[PDB]
């Protein structure tokens, strides 16, 4: 189950509080899997964080 969690941080706080308050991460809770990606044009390398 995916969550966007992006789009203009002043909006991301709303998503964070909605995930906190409306009973999302509890009572089964086997994974969360934070994941993003980096790109550095100076040397030309990506990164799979």
């Amino acid at each position: 189950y995916v969550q966007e969690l992006g789009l203009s941080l002043e909006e991301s706080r709303d998503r964070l509080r909605f995930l906190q308050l409306h009973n999302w991460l509890d009572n089964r809770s086997r994974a969360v899997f934070l994941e993003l990606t980096r790109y550095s044009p100076a040397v030309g390398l990506h990164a799979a964080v």
Binding site: V2, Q3, G6, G44, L45
Partner: protein, 97 residues
């Protein structure tokens, strides 16, 4: 001798063909790890406490003015079913949980 020397040249070009981008990768990954404070996260135990970490260091990193290109928005996942029935506390398993 000639066959082996051609094979060796092909192997060398296959392995060290772009070795100039091998010193940048180490510095890049180290910088990424130190920006994300990769010492508090590895000490996170379950106390409903990943949220302050997410709101303190992640979001400013993602949406900062002088931030990364980030190649798109991040994401969270979830796999699960039938919560554990409070596994036995005393004498916990080392890693075979």
């Amino acid at each position: 001798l000639l066959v082996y020397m051609l094979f060796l040249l092909v192997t060398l070009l296959a392995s060290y063909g772009d070795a100039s981008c091998h010193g940048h990768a180490y510095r890049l990954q180290s910088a990424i790890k130190q920006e994300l404070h990769s010492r508090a996260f590895l000490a996170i135990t379950r106390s409903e406490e990943l949220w302050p970490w997410m709101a303190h260091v992640l979001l400013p990193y993602v949406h900062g003015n002088q931030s990364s290109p980030e190649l798109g928005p991040p994401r969270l996942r979830q796999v699960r079913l039938q919560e554990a029935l409070y596994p036995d506390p005393p004498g916990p398993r080392v890693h075979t949980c």
